[PDB]
Design a protein around this ligand. Structure first.
Ligand SMILES: Nc1ncnc2c1ncn2[C@@H]1O[C@H](COP(=O)(O)OP(=O)(O)OP(=O)(O)O)[C@@H](O)[C@H]1O
Ligand SMILES: Nc1ncnc2c1ncn2[C@@H]1O[C@H](COP(=O)(O)OP(=O)(O)OP(=O)(O)O)[C@@H](O)[C@H]1O
Ligand SMILES: Nc1ncnc2c1ncn2[C@@H]1O[C@H](COP(=O)(O)OP(=O)(O)OP(=O)(O)O)[C@@H](O)[C@H]1O
Lengths: 447, 845, 387, 125
């Protein structure tokens, strides 16, 4: 009766009924009859023996699959599925197997991967992804067989790129978990059907899974030893060793230390053809990845010193490409430090960088006040210097920069009338404005 | 009386159905029931406009017993169409529901990183362009046809050691057919910081400012805007790219040359794989590391040539060869049916990529592009023949101020700028002269226009596809036959719904005399007859019954006169009679053709008597007799843009000694729209050579001139310099007589191309004032010329002078000009890019 | 019988042509004035360059130094006041999830606190369409007596007048500035070859100094090439390239004002396209034609002349119709529609609505046949009437 | 038959309120007096009379801002959510809204009771 009344046909589901059920359950004043209607809807579907695929289409229509998993509507679909399975034993289906019958497991794999990225759906995707590996284990699929079957739609190289690499290696954990005696020969066929680099990429991700750490490290180190003896350039071996995707923790990585010792050995054997260790990290991870490398490394006390080495080479790389100090002010993230910047240790390193930039490039030499004025408003400088002169330290820097701003004011012929109207309604501005008026009068009074 | 009213009822239904097809073609949904509905409605629409056109010509002919019977037949046919229309609404009500109402894909494409063959040189070319350049943000757009390898090359460029080393930060952005600018900025931000959750209330304006700040933290950035489709899409994304004067670069890949030109006026058109590289890719994709077996090597290179150096076609046939096994017989079978494996049997990879450009095409450009697939694969399509065919078919609908030829030429330019049609030849002025469609697009055109839209059907006698029967001809819309025309026509075919008959063959064939009237008898509703590849010995009374004819082109060696009954075809726009006879006499009432647009012939056409009405649509008269260039004929044709004169042109330039100045050439000057003029001489026995009438008699808006065998003295070339708008001048042998060539000061204010052939020139003196805009100057077979004037080296706009087997003095002067120009360039003078070509290298080197 | 994307505009940052003195004028009006929050509205017809001028002022070195806090807000035809206040709040604090259940009333007071912490503030309310929108948004802007400015851009003179009694009507580019803009757009840094200067200059003059038309036309010139013959084809069809060939830049921008018109005012605006492009339309003549056509339907106390007059004054306020001469009493005397808007009126009325049809025989087109005249409802003709 | 948003809170003159000085003082002095319990002072009139303008004049009046430590403006209307009103009032005092995602409406009203009670004498518009 409610279908005919609330639909004209061609509804393509029962959304008009379900949206009102949610509306009634949104308040306790109508929840009592709202649940009575909802239980009638589930009973109606069961009595008509509706396909759970069709019922999922009813819950899913009007929203993306990612949001559907994140809505309570998914829980209602599971409640329908349990009722459908219990009431009709003649044919049953699991949550993941019904899902596979609608979306092919290739289209399902990145759907569960996407639900893993969304932290709200991470828990649900965890139970669905495990069952998907269960149905692949049932069909007795090897990890290579899963790769080959899915490669027809994913692409040849997709499974060696994140986040597909993590989910594919994660299934290698569940495969070895039930089959502990064939892990060693699994990596042999991986190294035979793919190159050395493609083996290293899978091997590095395997070290993150406890059930595969022992075998992954055993293969990775032995394969690395036979490659360091080849004498190839360390630049080439760096990419082959899959060191270009380790992550922010590359400084604590054990393989990366093996390459560093090899690169030092190579460098001293070829003093006229020296290669740098920084430009490989800079190329592979990009400068923003180098910054993340420095901060994550410095967080660990066991590699603090080596985190200082990459920071020094990173700031040296700045001078090689000739980045102006006014831009390193932004690069060091001094723009988001707020006010009272003179006590920030990053300010000291920025000034040190400015000293080295002017010394190395004596054409475009700019002092500290030039860098600050090019990035921050004069009003913010008045706030910053007034909040720095009252400290037991940095008074000399504050006073010198205040004088520098005073001279910088008269360079552009800034009459006190314009400064008064610009600095209207802000404190700590009249004190320096009075000093500016007295300095302007003194300068004009000199014969 | 009421039959015309019933035509209005059918026309009202046709407006609804045509809008239904137009809306359905805007969204290729997966609904198969709608796919069969659009095919059924389209067939009814096609059968309806044919019946309406039959009614139109019947009413025109009437304003008698045979006419009454034909009127009753039209009424019965209209009634059948009306009853078929009612069945569509009665049974397919749901199908009309789905279209009058209204209502994952952003995954980046996969391209191979390793085993990239043939892009080492192209990558180095683009890299050298990215590293160099100016100090502000420059875009380097790589542009090419679908499946060419733009993304493969872009990813190769994105990963070289030189690109990675030089640039501070490199970012890959996948723009697509449809994209959200918010997602693009959040993806770039996601690479610098992972906490993209914090921008939920931050507008896209502050997102672009954040991308500005992130990219501006350091030095150069290279941003690979992949698959940009629109001018607007680049403008909306470039706002996130800072301009801090650090030689920042953007590497764009696109199928659109017009989008590429806006970003940089020098787009990098990607190259096609050679025959060696095409085979290298095929053997690397099918046999992987193992080499090709010797028995399969011969068929393998054959199929590699079938791809025409396109990587996408090579990848598609690679899957076909893997599935079909590895036998010599199967591989040779594939080589005979390469087009089937590209589109018909592999819609998963190749067809979708082609359809991305096709479904974006405007509705008018879709039929224009599919019509380009009628011509044989790899054949060269003349641009003027293609344009006139589009107008004749009705694909060009226009009401503005421009001519239909200029609008259709703009359609051809749009297709070329979309990389859906290649350009092989260009005129002197840069106008497209000859175009060719790529192989993969030709098979897609044939699949779409035969099995989906029924635009045209080909006739051939293959292994299993013999000549179609009566049932198949009852559904054929347009006929495209290449060979065996008399054999096909001998069976007395009966196609009552055929609207076009394109003889797309290259070699001319003589139609047997007993089968001449078979084309008009078979298809009474013929609208286009492209029989220029067929020689006709005589005209037939059946030809004069094709009242719907609009484009007619035919060759002949015997017919000297176009009969008067030819004028009964009042619908004709283009009239081409390529005859080998000396003269052609058009007795047809061509003035009654209100929509006549072109009359082309190789003989001296003798126009009929004009005896108010004006032929506003006539653009070309081509070669006509000098005596027919009267002021009365030119009155009836005010919009003429090309004029040709052939024969005894001394009747044109002769002085009217009776006392007036009404020489026949003076009437030509009254044509204000003339742009190109041709004169060809036949009679040489005049007592004195002809001399040019004064320049003010010439049409002032003339921009191209061509003379043949006119025997004009070199002294009367300076008067041609008084033409204000002349841009191209070309002369064949004996057009100018004499050995001494001298020029006055000034003149030729806008000349751009000059062409001379086999003249008696030996001495040449000129001045710098005669070449202010000259670009091309060829002197084919003018080996008697001694030396080029030194003033030519001072012409900045000069581009190329080509001579073969010239004199030793001419070669020495060319060497001196080249050496002095190179020395001047070494001294800081700006280079004009002047080149000299000598073929073969045995002489001159 | 039974039953939206926010796209903020993008404008030129470098090479803004002809706005050096308009930016200087508006900046002077921003710097000087009373101590209260003053609105400086920039008014103009669609595609005149209001946002380009506003962004030029927003990034001007003098303005940036003058106003410590500068906020760019994109108002539009449709907006939500809650997201407007959260967008402004996001300029200052990054934790915008802090205000999930905070009402808009306290959101506005939050913006009051953020803006008042320093000196002056300049707030560019881009694309304001109604006085209600300004009234609802201006809560967030405090009147703390600090010479604060609100720069505003709008197509509506009535909205501009209510914010300031002397709105800043933006200029049209001159003949040399139109040519300079088109030359820069097509040839980039290089100069125009002399073969293309003659038809190119005519192209820029036929754009009637509107920067939008010059930018749209330059897109067609870039695609077509650099030959003389192509540019004369464009010069002969400048209007068609703007509207018919480009239904995404010029057509959609004009439709933003045309679709917001009342249903009765739409026929009145399209009727102005019957007169020749660039020709002066007497306001008394236009009004009398509207009433005689039946467009003015009214039964109140006023006379139909006074009701059609404020229909015309509504079009002028919307800047869909420009005024060239005003009577001594201030009444509109002579009015003229811009060239691109006139092409929109022609394209919409002749093709989309069948309001009127032009009768002509130009170069190739001829007078309509019997089949076309049977469907024609209005005939407008300039020449060749007796024939 | 088969028929079924944004909170458009009215906007009023913050300045230049013409002729409401006597009306504001009359209602303000009425707010001061009365019983110690909860007492309502309803301002009633025809649409557009200035009820919200006078209410905002009293709401920001210096006498009211000094007398009443807690002043709350609630935009009730024809249609409203009883839950969102209590969340709106709570957002005045504590900014943590995530902890009330599942709290029942009556328990939210209980929380509003504690917030207003500790704030001393309060006025609610
Ligand atoms: N040089 C090459 N060597 C090997 N394979 C190639 C080469 N160039 C292209 N390919 C392959 O050709 C196919 C299509 O090429 P690609 O994806 O680069 O097309 P595209 O030009 O980007 O096309 P679209 O116009 O659809 O964007 C891909 O599978 C790619 O791997
Ligand atoms: N002085 C100028 N120089 C160069 N380009 C300009 C100039 N003025 C405007 N434009 C361009 O003209 C187009 C329209 O200008 P703008 O975006 O300022 O329009 P508008 O007047 O704000 O429009 P709307 O009527 O939609 O509010 C834009 O593409 C802009 O880049
Ligand atoms: N004393 C006043 N001085 C100036 N403007 C006033 C005054 N009183 C009201 N207004 C204006 O009158 C309009 C309506 O007044 P108000 O918003 O107070 O309505 P109201 O009486 O609360 O009505 P409603 O029942 O519709 O909410 C507003 O635009 C407001 O600015």
């Amino acid at each position: 009766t409610l279908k005919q009344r609330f639909s004209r046909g061609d509804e393509a589901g029962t959304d008009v009924l379900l949206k009102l059920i949610a509306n009634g359950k949104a308040t306790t004043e109508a929840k009592t009859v709202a649940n009575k209607v909802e239980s009638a809807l589930f009973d109606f579907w069961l009595n008509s023996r509706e396909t759970p695929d069709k019922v999922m289409d009813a819950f899913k229509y009007g929203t993306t699959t990612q949001a559907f998993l994140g809505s309570p509507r998914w829980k209602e679909w599971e409640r329908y599925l349990s009722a459908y399975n219990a009431r009709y034993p003649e044919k049953k289906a699991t949550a993941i197997e019904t899902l596979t019958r609608k979306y092919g497991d290739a289209q399902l794999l990145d759907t569960l991967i996407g639900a893993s990225s969304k932290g709200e759906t991470k828990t649900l995707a965890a139970k669905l992804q495990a069952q998907q590996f269960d149905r692949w284990m049932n069909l007795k699929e090897s990890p290579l067989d899963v790769y080959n079957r899915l490669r027809s739609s994913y692409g040849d190289t997709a499974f060696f790129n994140e986040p597909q690499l993590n989910v594919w290696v994660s299934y290698m954990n569940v495969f070895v978990d039930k089959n502990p005696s064939k892990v060693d020969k699994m990596f042999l066929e991986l190294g035979d059907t793919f190159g050395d680099m493609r083996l290293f990429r899978v091997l590095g991700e395997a070290k993150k899974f406890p059930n595969l750490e022992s075998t992954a490290t055993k293969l990775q180190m032995e394969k690395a030893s036979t490659l360091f003896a080849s004498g190839k350039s360390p630049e080439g071996i760096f990419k082959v060793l899959a060191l270009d995707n380790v992550g922010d923790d590359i400084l604590s990585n054990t393989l990366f230390h093996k390459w560093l010792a090899y690169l030092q050995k190579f460098n001293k054997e070829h003093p006229n053809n020296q290669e740098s260790w920084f430009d490989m990290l800079r190329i592979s991870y990009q400068p923003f990845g180098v910054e993340r490398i420095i901060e994550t490394g410095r967080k660990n006390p066991l590699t603090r010193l080596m985190a200082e080495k990459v920071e020094n080479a990173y700031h040296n790389y700045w001078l090689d490409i000739k980045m102006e100090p006014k831009t390193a002010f932004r690069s060091l993230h001094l723009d988001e430090s707020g006010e009272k910047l003179l006590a920030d240790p990053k300010f000291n390193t920025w000034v040190q960088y400015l000293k080295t930039f002017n010394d190395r490039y004596p054409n475009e030499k700019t002092t500290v006040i030039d860098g600050l004025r090019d990035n921050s408003h004069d009003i913010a400088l008045l706030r910053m210097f007034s909040a720095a002169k009252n400290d037991p330290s940095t008074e000399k820097l504050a006073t010198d920069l205040q004088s520098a701003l005073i001279l910088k004011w008269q360079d552009a012929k800034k009459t006190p009338e314009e400064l008064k109207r610009v600095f209207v309604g802000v404190p700590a501005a009249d004190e320096m404005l009075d000093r500016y008026i007295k300095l302007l009068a003194v300068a004009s009074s000199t014969p | 009386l009421g039959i015309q009213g019933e035509v209005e009822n059918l026309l009202t239904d046709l407006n609804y159905f045509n809008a239904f097809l137009k809306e359905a073609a805007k969204s290729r949904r997966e609904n198969e029931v709608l796919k069969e509905l659009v095919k059924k409605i389209r067939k009814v629409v096609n059968d309806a406009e044919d019946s309406i056109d039959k009614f139109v010509v019947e009413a025109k002919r009437h304003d008698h017993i045979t006419h009454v019977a034909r009127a009753k037949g039209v009424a019965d046919e209209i009634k059948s169409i009306r009853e078929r229309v009612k069945e569509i609404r009665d049974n397919d009500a749901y199908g009309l529901q789905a279209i009058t109402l209204d209502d994952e894909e952003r995954k980046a494409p996969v391209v191979e990183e390793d085993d990239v063959v043939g892009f080492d040189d192209e990558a180095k070319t683009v890299i050298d362009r990215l590293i160099g350049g100016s100090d502000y943000v420059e875009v380097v757009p790589v542009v090419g046809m679908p499946g060419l390898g733009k993304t493969t090359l872009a990813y190769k460029i994105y990963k070289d050691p030189k690109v990675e080393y030089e640039f501070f930060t490199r970012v890959w952005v996948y723009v697509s057919q449809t994209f959200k600018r918010r997602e693009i900025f959040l993806n770039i931000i996601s690479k610098f910081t992972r906490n993209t959750k914090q921008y939920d209330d931050t507008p896209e304006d502050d997102l672009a400012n954040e991308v500005k700040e992130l990219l501006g933290k350091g030095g150069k950035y290279l941003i690979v805007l992949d698959d940009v489709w629109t001018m607007e899409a680049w403008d909306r994304i470039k706002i996130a790219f800072p301009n801090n004067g650090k030689r920042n670069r953007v590497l764009m890949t696109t199928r659109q040359s017009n989008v590429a030109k806006r970003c940089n006026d020098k787009p990098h058109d990607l190259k096609f794989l050679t025959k060696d590289e095409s085979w290298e890719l095929l053997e690397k994709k099918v046999f992987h590391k193992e080499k090709c077996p010797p028995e399969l090597e011969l068929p393998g290179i054959s199929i590699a040539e079938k791809c025409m150096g396109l990587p996408l076609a090579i990848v598609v046939i690679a899957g076909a060869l893997i599935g079909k096994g590895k036998t010599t017989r199967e591989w040779e079978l594939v080589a005979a049916s390469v087009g089937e494996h590209l589109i018909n049997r592999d819609p998963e990879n190749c067809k979708k990529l082609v359809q991305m450009s096709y479904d974006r095409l405007p509705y008018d450009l879709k039929a224009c592009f599919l019509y380009c697939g009628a011509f044989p694969g790899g054949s060269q399509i003349p641009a003027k023949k293609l344009i006139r065919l589009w107008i004749a078919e009705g694909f060009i609908q226009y009401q503005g101020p421009l001519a239909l030829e200029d609008v259709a030429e703009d359609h051809l330019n749009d297709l070329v700028n979309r990389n859906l049609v290649m350009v092989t030849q260009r005129s002197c002025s840069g106008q497209i002269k000859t175009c060719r469609v790529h192989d993969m697009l030709h098979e897609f055109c044939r699949h779409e226009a035969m099995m989906e839209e029924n635009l045209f059907q080909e006739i051939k006698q293959g292994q299993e596809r013999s000549f179609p029967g009566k049932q198949e001809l009852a559904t054929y819309r347009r006929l495209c036959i290449q060979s065996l025309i008399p054999e096909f026509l001998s069976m007395k075919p009966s196609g009552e719904h055929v609207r076009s008959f394109l003889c797309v063959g290259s070699k001319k064939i003589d139609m047997p005399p007993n089968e001449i009237p078979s084309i008009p008898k078979a298809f009474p509703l013929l609208r286009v007859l492209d029989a220029e590849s067929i020689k006709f010995s005589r005209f037939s009374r059946e030809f004069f019954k094709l009242f719907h004819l609009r484009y007619i082109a035919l060759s002949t060696d015997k017919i000297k006169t176009i009969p008067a009954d030819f004028g009964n075809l009042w619908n004709i726009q283009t009239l081409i009679v390529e005859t080998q006879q000396a003269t052609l006499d058009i007795k047809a009432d061509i003035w009654n053709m209100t929509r006549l647009r072109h009359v082309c012939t190789n003989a001296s056409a003798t126009l009929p008597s004009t005896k108010n009405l004006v032929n506003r649509c006539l653009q070309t008269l081509s070669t006509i007799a000098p005596e027919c260039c009267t002021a009365e004929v030119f009155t009836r044709t005010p919009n003429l843009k090309k004029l040709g004169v052939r024969g005894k042109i001394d009747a044109l330039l002769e002085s009217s000694k009776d006392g007036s100045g009404s020489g026949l050439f003076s009437n030509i000057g009254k044509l204000g729209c003339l742009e190109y003029l041709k004169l060809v001489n036949d009679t040489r026995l005049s007592s004195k050579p002809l001399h040019l009438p004064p320049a003010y008699i010439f049409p002032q808006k003339l921009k191209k001139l061509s003379l043949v065998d006119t025997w004009f003295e070199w002294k009367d070339m300076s008067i041609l310099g008084l033409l204000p708008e002349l841009e191209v001048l070309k002369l064949k042998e004996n057009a100018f007589k004499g050995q001494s060539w001298e020029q006055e000061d000034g003149g030729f204010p806008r000349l751009q191309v000059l062409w001379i052939e086999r003249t008696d020139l030996t001495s040449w003196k000129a001045s710098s004032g005669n070449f202010p805009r000259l670009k091309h100057l060829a002197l084919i077979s003018c080996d008697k010329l001694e030396e080029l004037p030194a003033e030519l080296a001072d012409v900045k706009n000069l581009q190329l002078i080509e001579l073969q087997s010239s004199s030793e003095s001419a070669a020495r002067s060319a060497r001196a000009i080249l050496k002095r120009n190179q020395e001047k360039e070494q001294d800081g003078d700006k280079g004009t890019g002047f080149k000299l070509s000598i073929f073969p290298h045995d002489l001159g080197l």
